[PDB]
Ligand binder design. Structure first.
Ligand SMILES: Nc1ncnc2c1ncn2[C@@H]1O[C@H](COP(=O)(O)OP(=O)(O)NP(=O)(O)O)[C@@H](O)[C@H]1O
Length: 303
């Protein structure tokens, strides 16, 4: 960490300790923040402390006997102490749905930023790459299994110039399984399928590479039609055809090679985290003095 980084993490932890127990009645809804794959996310105000939080709701029935362990598990699963993972305030349950309260990122997600930005400049994506790598490094240490992908909608930013990942250690699907595990977990997936589900960090690197190309050109780089047929044809194209690449003559050689090494089809030849962190693009980006906060505030009109 660095001085300002640890300090901000310390400050957040102080705020977390001051909040205490989280109950639904203590929240006032301000605005909807975004629409998720598993439930909507709202900007809320925690009245007793006056803290602005992001409140994610997950529709699920949790029985009273099951409830206490589920919550206690959720508290643990969200315990992050990284400057690159979105802060976590607490989780609770009321009336057939679960609330996950986290640090409000007033810059929104990068898919939202991308929409207003059109496309995101290479030097900005340099800072994004560094944060994602360090975020993935921290997550892989804490969890053996990831449950969420690297994608623009999962990269949150703010006016302090911070770039963070959502906690990949938890998903709405996992929580469902946890609730089911008290009745009796039944998996009918073959060993080879389960091995595929427990993907290595090489899959995260692929996702980062594809996301970087998407954000650099302002569009998901592999086009597809609508309907079931077009969906299958897209996935088959990803599996069996050459990966997408940046439009030639636009971006630096370093950034070009960086995303190409992330998108190599063979995961054994695909670059790993160590190789990426010392890549020419990363070393150049780390040296660059980039005003991310300034660009962000000008782009989405933060101030
Ligand atoms: N802590 C936060 N601060 C600000 N905005 C947030 C926060 N969390 C989520 N959002 C916004 O709400 C949207 C919904 O997030 P989420 O429910 O995680 O959807 P998702 O990530 O697309 N689903 P998944 O496919 O499981 O990752 C995000 O894309 C963000 O724009």
């Amino acid at each position: 960490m660095t001085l300002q980084q640890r300090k901000r993490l310390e400050a957040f932890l102080t705020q977390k300790q001051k909040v205490g127990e989280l109950k639904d009645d203590d929240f006032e809804k301000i605005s909807e923040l975004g629409a998720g794959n598993g439930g909507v996310v709202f900007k809320v105000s925690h009245k007793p402390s006056g803290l602005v939080m992001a409140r994610k709701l997950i529709h699920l029935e949790i029985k009273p006997a099951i409830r206490n362990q589920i919550i206690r598990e959720l508290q643990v699963l969200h315990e992050s102490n990284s400057p690159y993972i979105v802060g976590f305030y607490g989780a609770f349950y009321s009336d057939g749905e679960i609330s996950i309260c986290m640090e409000h990122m007033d810059g929104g997600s990068l898919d939202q930023v991308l929409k207003k930005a059109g496309r995101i400049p290479e030097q900005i994506l340099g800072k994004v790459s560094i944060a994602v790598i360090k975020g993935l490094t921290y997550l892989r240490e804490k969890h053996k299994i990831m449950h969420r992908d690297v994608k623009p909608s999962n990269i949150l930013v703010n006016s302090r110039g911070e770039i963070k990942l959502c906690d990949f250690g938890v998903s709405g699907q996992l929580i469902d399984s946890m609730a089911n595990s008290f009745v009796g977990t039944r998996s009918y997936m073959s060993p080879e399928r389960l091995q595929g589900t427990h993907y290595s960090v090489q899959s995260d690197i692929w996702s980062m590479g594809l996301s970087l190309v998407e954000m650099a050109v302002g569009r998901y780089p592999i086009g597809s039609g609508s309907g079931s047929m077009a969906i299958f044809e897209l996935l088959d194209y990803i599996v069996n055809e050459p990966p997408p690449k940046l439009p030639s003559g636009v971006f630096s050689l370093e950034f070009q090679d960086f995303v190409n090494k992330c998108l190599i089809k063979n995961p054994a030849e695909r670059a790993d985290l160590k190789q990426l962190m010392v890549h020419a693009f990363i070393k150049r980006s780390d040296a660059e003095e980039v005003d991310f906060a300034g660009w962000l505030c000008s782009t989405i009109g933060l101030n």
